[PDB]
Design a binder for these strands. Structure first.
Ligand SMILES: [Mn+2]
Ligand SMILES: [Mn+2]
Ligand SMILES: [Mn+2]
Ligand SMILES: [Mn+2]
Ligand SMILES: [Mn+2]
Ligand SMILES: [Mn+2]
Ligand SMILES: [Mn+2]
Ligand SMILES: [Mn+2]
Ligand SMILES: [Mn+2]
Ligand SMILES: [Mn+2]
Ligand SMILES: [Mn+2]
Ligand SMILES: [Mn+2]
Ligand SMILES: [Mn+2]
Ligand SMILES: [Mn+2]
Lengths: 99, 82, 105, 94, 99, 87, 106, 97
DNA sequence: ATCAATATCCACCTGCAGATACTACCAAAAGTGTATTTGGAAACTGCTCCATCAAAAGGCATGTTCAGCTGGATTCCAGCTGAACATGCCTTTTGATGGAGCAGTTTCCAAATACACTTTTGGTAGTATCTGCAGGTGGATATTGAT
DNA sequence: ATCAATATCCACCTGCAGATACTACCAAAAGTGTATTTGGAAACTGCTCCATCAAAAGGCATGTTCAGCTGGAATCCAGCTGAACATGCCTTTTGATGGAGCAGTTTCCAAATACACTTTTGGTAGTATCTGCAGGTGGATATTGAT
């Protein structure tokens, strides 16, 4: 039989891997596309300093990571180990980001 | 192939973010939920940044524009000036 | 001519702290003691972080402090972490931490 | 062309005093700059409000002290107050 | 044959009653003693304006009411109807009061 | 010539029915028995942090009397702005 | 005969006082003449917005005198005033009636 | 001895109340709330305008700073109308004398 | 327990991006010295309001009994999500290249500050008098729960 | 569905706390006018650095299969927690008093602003040398999961 890890084993491996490193985890160019598209709604023909886009990706990735931690606590609170939109919503509600 | 920009924020990249957040198991609906949350964040921060840009009568969003905006939103960022 | 920093025993620039205060529109006047005190407080806080960050660099067997080290220093210190609770350090990453119930067996 | 001030070389001075054989990357130096700027703004801002609340036009070392007590957690506040008092004392005598 | 409302009925009546009114729910004199005791431990020989104590009670009751709201959402999230200490703790963690 | 009696254990002046009423206004239907001591602990932390800051404002003004404004300023900086007592 | 800057601006709120508070507040070295006018207008508009909504809440409660409860109802029931004053406590304002559906009997 | 003058926005709040609800009154505690509100929003806008001016190395807070501060601080429709009311008042003010 | 498959760690090596050590240049900024102004500490004290008192009473806390129904444990199973592997698609690199536009410099005027003088006003202060509605009662309607 | 116990509604009323009204007073505030200063908009422009372009390079995202195991549904029941009751305590209320200390006013000097001048410094720009460590290698060995 070919080798196969149990579900969750590799997930745990990834957690250790990415909690150890600091490199950004979203691809640069798709993120840059997204930023310019959104900015275009507020003002047309905008240019961006490169450091401006990087500042945005740093802040945005740091935000999502923090949110996922709080989401995880909510899932575990309901005796689950799987995060759900239900969990993200609760965290954002309690954070005061909505409702 | 036709492709929306927010859909450019891919499932595997969202997965990695969750992993750094210590998340072990992910529901299928998380990925669309996350993209919606991401979008609101960027909209709120970029709106404030561009407003600083317009006031300074510029056409270029600077790092400082972004930094000031993040501070406003209570997301103070170190390392990009100010 | 002896600088106010030297005169106060500080590495941090007293004259600059003073100019920054009165040009900052914090008040009409600024006492002579205020920039000395403030420069002193800033230098000390800088020293406390650099101390802890240096140790973090040592633990990772490095000799050059990088953002990651500053993050480890701050988040592992109860009081620095509280003081900078709403601050994100660019390229800092997070602390290794896994909820116990997610561990196998 | 114009000039841009930072706390870099003062940060570096303090670094060699506590870790003589340790260096610091420029990215890390940027973070320390942000840190010093942030805490300056916080302390100055609080001192400003203090003076205004008490119908005062002067920010003295007394305002800076109360601001520090308000802003820093227990032990950090204690040492910072001590460092501050020490420096103003040695500035009066010297 | 003596009348009894079912468990939960009077509780709901009470919710409607207190969400309809605005008066302080903690007894006045006991709260004042609590303030003086805590203040005294920080600094001796303090005096209080009467409005100063009332400001503290308005703040404390608004804080606790808001916290119980978030606590309630945490319990319901766990498919419970009964708030428990772990619910309060979760709410305060996500709020960033303990994190 | 005199001094007031010792102040102690006043946190228990925050009674179980008082805590029940606050939960009700917060929309809470059912309450576990351990909630009351948890609430007292949480309240005490909140009160200490606000009073500490308020008294700090008092001392800086060289007063012996904590004012409503001392409290309002303390609440403002703790991120709990209060309307109805202040400036 | 002198005209107030308020009347000259068509405002109920005091332009002269607002101008003074800007200078006395250490916000900047200089303060332009248009700044207190604009600010007084914005403050007045916001006051009008809240009083309008609070007056309605008073009416719906069969009252003719606005009390803090009415101010709170008007604020928390308006999505935008609620956002603006999301970190604000209204003394003696209470809360909105709101019972989670799952709590109701069935 | 005369107790010093304590300024408030009461008589102006009251005026606007009468424009908006001619037959409606306001309690002193409610007026207290309204006073806290005006002072709070004053400080927010002024503070934001101050930062704005400092970021751009300007020593003058003009109506332009106030406007951008209002856009940064107020949500959607509130910002829209406030900006309009503010602009309108300034043009009228300058079209006199 | 054995044992094979990967993952993970340690020691060492080397190219290079980024740290450094150097000399020189200079505008701004910090230090010095002097004359002028003034903020706020002292002293004194008027007067608000805080602490403390008593006393009567009923709203409300405490403590107990009883059992309804909720929380928590257990089992069970459909299907969702993780792991792995095969494609192939587009992010990344970097290097060069216009040129948009940030930013530095010069000019100069509309608008801001400073100041003296005149007038208007909003804030007590003292009484004097309406008035909205809190809280009480009583009786009709609605809700809840047993049967 | 019926019915009884109890909560809920609403009309009506009365006492009064608190809102409204008026006059007098006035110190600060607000406005007007004149003279003087200067912030920053405007116009031009040099040089940074942003956008785009090509063009491999391949790393990484997408689609699919399969099944391990997690989520959720169902069932049961011990005991926690809500409802109701009896008891009586301590908070609430009302009012008075003394005086602590907050605050209002006036005097007065240490310290801070305002210039003018001198000197030091920190940011700079090339220019050249140096090095901490990322990334690659091999091979030891720890971990995981099949038996
Ligand atoms: Mn004690
Ligand atoms: Mn004076
Ligand atoms: Mn039973
Ligand atoms: Mn159940
Ligand atoms: Mn051009
Ligand atoms: Mn008048
Ligand atoms: Mn009634
Ligand atoms: Mn100029
Ligand atoms: Mn199966
Ligand atoms: Mn399960
Ligand atoms: Mn008893
Ligand atoms: Mn005395
Ligand atoms: Mn030098
Ligand atoms: Mn390595």
């Amino acid at each position: 039989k070919p080798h196969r890890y149990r579900p969750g084993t590799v997930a745990l491996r990834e957690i250790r891997r990415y909690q150890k490193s600091t490199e950004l985890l979203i691809r640069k160019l798709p993120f840059q596309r997204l930023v310019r598209e959104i900015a275009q709604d507020f003002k047309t023909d905008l240019r961006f300093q490169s450091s401006a886009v990087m500042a945005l990706q740093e802040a945005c990735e740091a935000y999502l990571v923090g949110l996922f931690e709080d989401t995880n606590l909510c899932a575990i609170h309901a005796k689950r180990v799987t995060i759900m939109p239900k969990d993200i919503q609760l965290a954002r509600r309690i954070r005061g980001e909505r409702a | 192939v036709l492709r929306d920009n927010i859909q450019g924020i891919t499932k595997p990249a969202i997965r990695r973010l969750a992993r750094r957040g210590g998340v072990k198991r992910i529901s299928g609906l998380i990925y669309e939920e996350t993209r919606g949350v991401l979008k609101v964040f960027l909209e709120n921060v970029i709106r404030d940044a561009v407003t600083y840009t317009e006031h300074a009568k510029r056409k270029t969003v600077t790092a400082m524009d972004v930094v000031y905006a993040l501070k406003r939103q209570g997301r103070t960022l170190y390392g990009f000036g100010g | 001519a002896k600088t106010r920093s030297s005169r106060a025993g500080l590495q941090f620039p007293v004259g600059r702290v003073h100019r920054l205060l009165r040009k900052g529109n914090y008040s009409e006047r600024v006492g002579a003691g205020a920039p000395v005190y403030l420069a002193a407080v800033l230098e000390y806080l800088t020293a406390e972080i650099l101390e802890l960050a240096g140790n973090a660099a040592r633990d990772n067997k490095k000799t050059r402090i990088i953002p990651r080290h500053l993050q480890l220093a701050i988040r592992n210190d109860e009081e620095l972490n509280k003081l900078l609770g709403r601050v994100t350090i660019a390229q800092g990453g997070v602390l290794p931490n896994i909820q116990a119930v997610l561990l196998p067996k | 062309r114009s000039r841009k001030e930072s706390y870099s070389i003062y940060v570096y001075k303090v670094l060699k005093q506590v870790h003589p054989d340790t260096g610091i990357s420029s990215k890390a130096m940027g973070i320390m700059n942000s840190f010093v700027n942030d805490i300056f703004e916080r302390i100055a801002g609080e001192a400003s409000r203090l003076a205004h609340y008490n119908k005062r036009s002067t920010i003295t070392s007394r305002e800076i002290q109360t601001a520090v007590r308000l802003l820093l957690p227990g032990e950090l506040a204690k040492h910072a107050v001590s460092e501050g008092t020490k420096a103003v004392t040695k500035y009066t005598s010297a």
